[PDB]
Design a protein around this ligand. Structure first.
Ligand SMILES: Nc1ncnc2c1ncn2[C@@H]1O[C@H](CSCC[C@H](N)C(=O)O)[C@@H](O)[C@H]1O
Lengths: 17, 480
């Protein structure tokens, strides 16, 4: 799979850092 | 009164912009108090729909169908366990390409850039840095636009989630003394800070004038928007294939999670998301995908559910070489040559082996004698020894192994002692109390942390004995 798609992939929500 | 809300959001912004404070629980309850006071003074979601969410699924299918998506072979069903999902209406064989969504249907950072949000986006430093927040405001703006291209998608989304942003105080309280609760704290604070910041920005920025949010933007709006994004968003390539971006993927994102492998990928040539069946699905069976190899802390906090028998579950463990160590410089140099920081947060895994190659390599260096360090620093074999540092088949010495597994056993045992309940009390709570879904998520999460630690204790104890046997019997050391 060249571009696997991760449902709900975790992202950084910390706008201060 | 708009003046009181402006007053309260300024206080919330101030409160949630101060640095991290054994004061984290007190701070959290302080922020909760402010958020709930604001929430109780507002009118919930700015935009609500007349129908039940299932009333809008036929519009979702027709819209997706007209834009080239697969709409045959499954139906939408409200399952008790997972909520709404897809059910097969015919037999679908493992590896069949049964579900595809062209890019035109997606909501992306790029479509956010080209929407009514565009002007505010080009000026606000947070929106430019954080595509997830941009996606959240994109969703809100389109939700409040009655002729949005994406209304069929937005009207079929949930109105609520089980992310910890929706937990009651007593439901979060179950998590006191755990690792996960500090990420619950951070999510709540980030979200309250972001709501207050953007509330003020939307009121003061000319670029926000045409946004529907300028006339109504509630804390409930923002909690819904970020929870929609964190429970459903995806990384996909840009159209040029040159970059990655964040996207909401209609229709396909209705699939619920089961154990397995990723079987959804982006097809750049035809510019669509493609999903092949993870397993056989008989007609009448729910269609599942595997979301990804996340921990149960991540499933709870970012996906709003606890997955039983999550074989990728893990806990964090912080470790570093101390500058008080007499061999600090040598150890730091060996770690650097192996590409490993002198301090970091590693993971302990539920599935054996409990530690990764990187953590094994760190622990070996952490427990090396000076002579062993010299052999990883000097001479014609040093680089070979760095190369095998993460390989359990090639120990540095039997003594090094005994030392590192002894260290790990004691540390995991020490960590177990920092929880306010035992594993057995947790099982007793789950057996004898009648609990909400959210409360059960919290207690299962705190039980899972301890069970991972307990499994790590047993595994390290077994490894210590294995390697002490090799040492006592003077086994020949494997050679690379
Ligand atoms: N295995 C599972 N157990 C419980 N809930 C699940 C689950 N897999 C997915 N979910 C739920 O589905 C959400 C991801 S989007 C999947 C569709 C969703 N059920 C809906 O009604 O729109 C998650 O936030 C969680 O609420």
């Amino acid at each position: 799979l060249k571009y696997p798609i991760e449902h709900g992939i975790v992202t950084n929500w910390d706008d201060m850092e | 009164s708009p003046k009181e809300i402006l007053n309260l959001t300024s206080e919330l912004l101030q409160k949630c912009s101060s640095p991290a404070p054994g004061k984290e629980w007190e701070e959290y309850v302080q922020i909760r108090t402010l958020v709930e006071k604001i929430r109780k003074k507002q009118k919930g979601l700015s935009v609500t729909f007349d129908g039940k969410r299932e009333d809008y699924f036929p519009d979702l299918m027709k819209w997706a169908s007209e834009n080239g998506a697969s709409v045959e072979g499954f139906e939408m069903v409200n399952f008790k366990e997972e909520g709404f999902g897809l059910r097969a209406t015919r037999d679908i064989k493992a590896e069949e390409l049964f579900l595809w969504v062209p890019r035109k249907l997606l909501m992306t950072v790029e479509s956010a850039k080209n929407s009514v949000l565009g002007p505010l986006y080009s000026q606000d430093r947070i929106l430019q840095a954080m595509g997830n927040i941009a996606l959240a405001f994109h969703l809100l703006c389109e939700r409040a636009s009655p002729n949005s291209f994406w209304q069929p998608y937005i009207q079929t989304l949930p109105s609520e989630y089980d992310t910890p942003l929706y937990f009651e105080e007593d439901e979060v309280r179950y998590l006191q003394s755990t690792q996960a609760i500090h990420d619950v704290f951070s999510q709540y604070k980030n979200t309250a800070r972001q709501y207050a910041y953007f509330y003020k920005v939307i009121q003061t920025h000319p670029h926000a004038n045409k946004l529907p949010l300028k006339d109504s933007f509630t804390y409930e709006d923002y909690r819904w928007a970020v929870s929609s994004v964190m429970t459903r968003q995806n990384q996909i390539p840009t159209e040029d294939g040159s970059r990655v971006t964040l996207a909401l993927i209609p229709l396909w994102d209705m699939c619920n999670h089961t154990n397995g492998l990723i079987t959804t990928g982006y097809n750049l040539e035809d510019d669509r998301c493609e999903c092949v069946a993870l397993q056989d699905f008989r007609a009448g069976e729910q269609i599942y995908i595997f979301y990804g190899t996340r921990s149960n802390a991540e499933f709870v906090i970012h996906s709003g559910f606890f997955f039983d028998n999550n074989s990728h579950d893990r806990v964090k463990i912080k470790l570093g070489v101390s500058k008080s160590d007499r061999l600090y410089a040598m150890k730091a140099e060996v770690l650097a040559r192996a590409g490993i920081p002198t301090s970091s947060v590693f993971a302990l895994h539920f599935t054996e082996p409990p530690i990764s190659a990187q953590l094994l390599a760190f622990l070996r260096v952490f427990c090396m004698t000076e002579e062993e360090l010299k052999e990883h620093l000097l001479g014609d074999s040093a680089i070979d020894r760095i190369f095998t540092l993460g390989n359990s088949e090639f120990p540095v010495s039997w003594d090094n192994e005994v030392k590192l597994w002894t260290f790990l056993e004691d540390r995991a045992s020490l960590l177990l002692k920092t929880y306010k309940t035992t594993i057995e009390e947790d099982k007793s709570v789950l057996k004898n109390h009648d609990l909400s879904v959210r409360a059960k998520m919290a207690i299962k999460l705190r039980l899972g942390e301890k069970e991972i630690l307990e499994k790590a204790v047993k595994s390290a104890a077994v490894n210590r004995e294995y390697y002490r046997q090799q040492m006592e019997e003077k086994a020949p050391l494997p050679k690379y």
